[PDB]
Write a protein that binds this DNA or RNA. Structure first.
Lengths: 293, 290
DNA sequence: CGCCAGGGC
DNA sequence: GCCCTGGCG
């Protein structure tokens, strides 16, 4: 009933009532039929896939968040307080009595939305690479924690970063793009792709990132609308082509017995992470099977 | 009516109803009585000053924010929609009818608080240096934009980065500390101070910052409470002593013809910016007459 | 353009 | 430990 206890309640209810960002992305991926599309589809249509995935995730989330918000706000309506108030004075009281509650709820909502938007964007990209058939290790499933996807895998990367691809994602950049050169420079990363839906980043940012060997990747629509001229801004289609070309380099490479068991271990860990997601397990198990192929 | 007409209203109403972060910090600086403290107070007790400033700025805003929201929400109340509704039913209606309007207002508020919190933290630090009598340029009153304070000034820094100090500030770090090595490395900065009140940053972060020549500075309270043994964490007290030592090297310097002209121009800009603030203006006038 | 009185995941 | 369905200053 206090602003404090209401936070704990919002917390408890959120966790109960919302599936994980990745579970939502996976649900949506299968619902939109992407789980039956061949790898060429993802290779050829990554920008449209991303936007459709984004659109549907939000379409499903937003009526649900609205009702969760309405419901939260209802664990604090006080029928006994508001006995003989007029409807106007009733609403008046509400806007006066529970400012920290209302605000804390909306605060918890935005903080969830921010965390989830990033996590779902990463998950969307992750499934994109999987759908494309491209060997990746997912950061949060197995190099700074800022990298989301390591192609073909951390084991191979750790051995030698040649012919690899590292992809990070930020739905919008603000000044937070500055984090990426920091991480690139901290670990000696050769280059990083920085996937974004941001329509507003500047040329000065692009050039600083360029100097730091961070490549911005966005949708064709965003690129053609806002960065048409600009060969420093890539599309997801460019990226996916690059990833596809580099993945042919990992195709029938023979690992030493030692690296092979490390790759297996890494894949096994990720299958574990993605235990409840047949499409992803299947994706990893093909990679596992590829080592004995 | 529409959120697009209510968010345009939220912004109109905020601009109209709240004084700027600096002005709040300045009001607070002077209310606490800091405009009467000698330079040695600021030099010797920077953490006490910062803590007390942060304490009170919040108090002289927290109640106020609370009421601003209430006023804003009263513009959603539709007398004709709700007349003859049960009061409880009018509340259910309200919590079902405008919860975007309600989110949009609390979102705008937190976005205000975050922005104001950093800008007030910078302002608190800037008046700490002014209070201490230390020559600084205030980056946003005329080196990355991330740097708030350049001691003794950007003209001299540009002449030679030796004997200078750059201070940046983040109320909390999260992963955003990563911006600072980026900025240090991008411009060849020797070292930067990162002022923070964050009590939760890890050893890894401290070590990464350290390698990057970013010096983390926090209150003596936070240091002794969270980082007591770690000598890579400085206190504002350590920082102020360092700023003080460097400032001497500048006060019996003699500039050439051309540099003094850039400097007074730099100051000129900052007297213009803080025109409406006597204590700060006083600060720059003395600087200008040398 | 930077801030993050910043909780969620 | 990173996210920023992120507007404000």
């Amino acid at each position: 009933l206090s602003p404090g206890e209401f936070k704990t309640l919002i917390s408890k209810e959120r966790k109960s009532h919302f599936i994980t960002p990745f579970a939502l992305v996976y649900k949506t991926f299968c619902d939109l039929g992407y789980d039956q599309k061949n790898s060429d589809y993802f290779l050829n249509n990554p920008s449209e896939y991303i936007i459709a995935m984004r659109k549907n995730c939000w379409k499903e989330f937003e009526p649900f968040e609205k009702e969760f918000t309405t419901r939260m706000l209802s664990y604090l309506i006080d029928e006994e307080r508001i006995k003989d108030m007029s409807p106007y004075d009733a609403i008046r009281d509400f806007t006066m009595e529970y400012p920290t509650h209302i605000y804390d709820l909306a605060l918890s909502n935005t903080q969830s939305r921010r965390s989830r938007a990033g996590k779902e964007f990463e998950s969307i990209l992750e499934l994109l690479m999987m759908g494309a058939g491209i060997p990746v290790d997912v950061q949060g499933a197995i190099i700074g924690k800022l990298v989301d996807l390591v192609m073909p895998g951390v084991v191979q990367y750790t051995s030698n970063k040649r012919n690899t691809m590292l992809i990070s994602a930020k739905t919008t950049l603000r000044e937070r793009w500055q984090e990426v050169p920091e991480e690139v420079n901290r670990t000696g990363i050769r280059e990083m792709y920085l996937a974004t839906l941001d329509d507003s980043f500047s040329e000065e940012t692009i050039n600083i990132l360029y100097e730091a060997n961070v490549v911005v990747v966005t949708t064709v629509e965003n690129k053609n609308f806002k960065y048409k001229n600009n060969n420093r801004v890539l599309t997801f289609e460019d990226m996916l082509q690059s990833a596809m070309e580099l993945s042919r380099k990992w195709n029938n490479v023979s690992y030493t017995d030692s690296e092979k068991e490390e790759i297996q271990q890494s894949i096994l860990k990720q299958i574990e992470k993605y235990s409840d997601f047949p499409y992803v397990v299947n994706y990893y198990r093909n990679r596992l099977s590829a080592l004995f192929d």
